[PDB]
Amino acid sequence: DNKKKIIITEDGEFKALQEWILETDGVSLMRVLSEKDVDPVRTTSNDIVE
Amino acid sequence: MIIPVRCFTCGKIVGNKWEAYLGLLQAEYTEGDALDALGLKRYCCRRMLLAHVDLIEKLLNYAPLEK
Amino acid sequence: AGILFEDIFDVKDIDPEGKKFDRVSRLHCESESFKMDLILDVNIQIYPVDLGDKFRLVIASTLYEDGTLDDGEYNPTDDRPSRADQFEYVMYGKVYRIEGDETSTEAATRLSAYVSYGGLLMRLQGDANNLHGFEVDSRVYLLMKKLA
Amino acid sequence: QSLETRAEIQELAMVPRMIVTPQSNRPVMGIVQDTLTAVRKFTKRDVFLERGEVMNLLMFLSTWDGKVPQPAILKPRPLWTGKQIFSLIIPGHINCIRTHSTHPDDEDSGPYKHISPGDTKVVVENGELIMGILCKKSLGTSAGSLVHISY
Amino acid sequence: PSNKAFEKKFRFDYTNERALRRTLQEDLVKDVLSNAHIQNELEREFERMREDREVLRVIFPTGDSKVVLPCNLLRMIWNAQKIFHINPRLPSDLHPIKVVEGVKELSKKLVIVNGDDPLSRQAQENATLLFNIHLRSTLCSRRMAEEFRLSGEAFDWLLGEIESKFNQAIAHPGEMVGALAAQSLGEPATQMTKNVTLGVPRLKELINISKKPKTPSLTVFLLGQSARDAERAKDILCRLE
Amino acid sequence: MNAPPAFESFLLFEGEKKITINKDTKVPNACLFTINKEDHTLGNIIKSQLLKDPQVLFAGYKVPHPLEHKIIIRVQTTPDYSPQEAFTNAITDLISELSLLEERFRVAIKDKQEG
Amino acid sequence: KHMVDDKIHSRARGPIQILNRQPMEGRSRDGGLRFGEMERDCQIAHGAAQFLRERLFEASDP
Amino acid sequence: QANQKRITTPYMTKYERARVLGTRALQIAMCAPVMVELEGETDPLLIAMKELKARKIPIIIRRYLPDGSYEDWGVDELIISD
Amino acid sequence: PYANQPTVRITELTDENVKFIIENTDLAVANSIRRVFIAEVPIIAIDWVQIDANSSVLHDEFIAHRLGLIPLTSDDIVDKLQYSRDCTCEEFCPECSVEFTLDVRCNEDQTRHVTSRDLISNSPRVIPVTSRNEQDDILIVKLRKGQELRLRAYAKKGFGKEHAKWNPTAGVAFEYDPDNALRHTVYPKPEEWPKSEYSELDEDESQAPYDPNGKPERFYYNVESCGSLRPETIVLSALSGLKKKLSDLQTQLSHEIQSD
RNA sequence: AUCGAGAGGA
Ligand SMILES: [Zn+2]
Ligand SMILES: [Zn+2]
């Protein structure tokens, strides 16, 4: 659940959402974020310099 | 090096049984039979005799320093 | 006289889930006079019990026949008349939980008292009327005696 | 070699003051091999100590008021349980609810939640070990353990 | 808890006459039923709890209720119950408005950043926001009345103990927190040993900024249908690889 | 280098008394007996014989440290009794039991040899 | 061969080195223990400034 | 800084307590008058602890703020946590 | 409130060991008697060696220690002799020590065995046990041509609480409740355990049924002697020593009470 | 006593 999408239903509990994720072998964060149908709020990186 | 006087665990004398044990061994007795003959009922004393190596005989080969 | 609960129980099962301990066995007993339910840990090494045995349980807040509060201290050199002399198996413990089916509005129709005799647990459940004398953090005695 | 150094070491670096680490908000000390195995065996439901045994054990209790507790079994022979002695060992009126290493996952769901058939579900109330068998998960360096609650 | 669970567990009721009679004593239930100021204050308390619940939802996006806070309020409640011989089967003499004003006064007493100027006031509010939210949630009038059944003296002792414990938990000037952090981070290292670099190599890779990470990676999340269906997501994968 | 002498475990140091009587304050009619250069050999028998007494509420012994050579015996008696008297009676009874056992052992030895 | 008799060693104002007036090295030379960087580190975390001064200045090389 | 107001915490810190106890113990061991009635105590550490518990320590703590100012606190004016 | 009334029953009495059963006594008393058997029975042992000459392969410590381990006849002279601590004489005297002398030179080609027969004592009643008028003599050292041993030894009085050489027992077998009636030992699988020498049970049964109102009685003994004392003398002297220690404790207690 | 090397212990 730490990597899923956690939402709040109309009733008001936490419901994890099963959605696809993509893990890359490289780092191009600006270009990846500037892509269609890619979440720019949750997409991150593990290269601190970038 | 030499046979201890007493068993470490119980303190029974075993320092007067090495020569008799060797004689029994040369008399075709099994090691356990010799231990029973010498009245070594406890396995501590049986260890004390069965596991003993006698380095005093090897040390006696070298000549004395003082004549 | 210091007696909270007194009834005759019939043993219906003994370690129904398995003998978890060597010298202690759980008892599942039911009564007939008050229709109670009992689960008791007994030292079967010194007090052996079997299926179908019938005894009387006497839960008391004091071991003296006359009403006198107990200090909860070992005083073997005591000659005062005690009701322990009329029983075969007595255990000293404290009540650690009382549970009922009460709602936010209605009262409790049934009750369940939990006692710990130094780790030997006991749950007595049934009607709320006959368990009214039990209070949490209070010391009680078991006072069991088999009958034929 | 100096009085101020001795005083500051006493007031800061004493072992009792060093029980809980700021690294992980938990005790750094606990119960170790022999005492841990012995307390696991001692706090079992089927441990019964005779009069002489109880007195001999009480001779080794520093914070003892001198009053022998009422035995958990009075007849047909006076007997004290290990949980009673450890209850009297426990200091103050600390409250604690823990779990033993053999506690089943379905015990808290079905019946006998508060009356454990396996003597799990350690409960200490008013400094008294009401029930349960103690282990690392109750006398060790884990957060929320008995020693942590005591500190 | 859900919205319905939150309301049921934390909204003090003053319409169920029988429930109130069971919960509290006769004079207290009569006063609560009669006085409308009491009801208005309790409504405001529930509104504050709802705002705190929303703030908590914001602060913790995931439903992780585990927090590290100074005072074990549940343990102190248990200690108060044991000390004051509270009977959980009888109505209590504790007034819910006494509870509410007690929580407000205790919140005023627990200070981290002192002063009266707005900057310091907001700093103190931010510094104690989590503990105050937890304290209000635990010391709810409904909880203290129907679940904890505390008495007036028990509540007073609880407030005093909370204040003393928080003042004890406040950090001490002169503490070498830098050395503390360095040692507390270096100790695990001695015990710690697709594919992602982990352990001491990654810890070193972090401390000395590495221009060239050993295993650089991107965790890409999808926005629209792509996240649900597979064809569009593999299409995005082709677009990115 | 710091090996204690062999005879230190039983030889009394000069100026050091064999026994010492201290009174327990936590409970009434209780006393602490501290015996130097003694061990479980005397502690266990004294404790058991004190446990025989029906007017001894408590009787226990301990060795505070196996490296040290002292024992502590705690006796708590009835309000009409004294821990000193309980200790004295226990010692006297142990003396009598040992004398009886020794005489009976000598008799049995004589019978076994003489047939 | 590990006999404690060859591992015990205590120092109280013994010989000092010649390049720096600090205690010698090795029990064979009656030298003291080294209060190293990690030890000063832990004392820093403690906050025992007077003890740190005593160890590194007063008891080492005043 | 006016004595009417102070921004530091009113509680003595562990470091302040340790240093005050050590300094007062050294002063006592150097023949200073005692502010408590010594029943039978003869060791400076417990004498200083008794003085601290009596809140009769003749020492003023100069808490240096980072800005460069300082606030002077008496030992009797500080709450003792332990 | 009074003492027990114990009874003895000797099953086997030889020149090496004694077998007896003590009935109607406490476990504390039985274990104390056993402990005194081991550690609080005064016997005579060598504790002072002055090696004039030693050309053997064993060093002087080695030789002395081996000589000290040699037991000596202590049956009757142990009571007359007093500890050198309490003796008012000089370092040694006839009333607190026993003289010894060894003088062996190996001049023949055959290896010379220095046994306990070479130990010559001033006291006729204090001799090595193997030299008493079978078992051979204890080997002290072996000597080849040229090697020679010359030493003087003194035999003092002490108990096993000081050194193991003053211990007069070659094993004190102790057992109570041969059938596990009291459940002192919990056998996870009782059938795996052999019956005791004193067990009274059939082969189909492993241990006696549980006895809830029983305490340890009928303590069994097997006191093997190292030759310093006869086993009967060992038991008698241990009982007397325990009685004496209790008596000194009683005297000290009376003095302390009078001081209050 | 200094340097260097080697062998080791936790
Ligand atoms: Zn042996
Ligand atoms: Zn003499």
Coordinates of C-alpha atoms in Angstrom, one line a residue, chain D residues 2-12 17, chain H residues 14-15 17-18 21-22 26 29 43 45 49 82:
Chain D
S2 CA 37.6 15.3 40.2
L3 CA 34.4 16.0 42.1
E4 CA 32.6 17.9 39.4
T5 CA 33.5 15.2 36.8
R6 CA 32.2 12.5 39.2
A7 CA 29.0 14.5 39.8
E8 CA 28.3 15.1 36.2
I9 CA 29.0 11.4 35.3
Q10 CA 26.6 10.4 38.1
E11 CA 23.9 12.8 36.9
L12 CA 24.1 12.0 33.2
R17 CA 19.5 6.8 33.2
Chain H
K14 CA 20.1 17.9 33.4
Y15 CA 23.4 19.5 32.4
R17 CA 21.8 20.2 37.5
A18 CA 24.9 18.1 37.0
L21 CA 25.8 19.7 41.9
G22 CA 29.5 19.3 41.0
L26 CA 33.6 21.1 45.2
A29 CA 34.7 20.0 50.0
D43 CA 30.1 13.4 51.6
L45 CA 27.7 14.8 46.7
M49 CA 21.9 16.9 46.7
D82 CA 14.5 15.1 39.3

